[PDB]
Symmetry: C2
Subunit: 58 residues, 2 copies
Amino acid sequence: LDQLIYIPLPDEKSRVAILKANLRKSPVAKDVDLEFLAKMTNGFSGADLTEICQRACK
Amino acid sequence: LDQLIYIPLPDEKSRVAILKANLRKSPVAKDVDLEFLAKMTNGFSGADLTEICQRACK
């Protein structure tokens, strides 16, 4: 194992795509703005976004 | 000295008022949205906001 690849925290477009990919199974109303939702969450990881999606589902 | 008062980091309306109070001397164009500017800066102090205002002035 000689290649080293660093994987940082996700950027804004990445957060948009994570929030889209987590919610394909759920019926989401079209009134919801995900692009505003990715702007507030500066410094989250993927697991935090999955956590908040599942909490809204609960 | 028997009273103890805790002073936390400023909230969102407080950040709006800090950004307003720092920029009274400067000619600011009316196209600038400060209320959007206070939403991004979750967890700044007052000195950080004065720093970024003076850097824009520079």
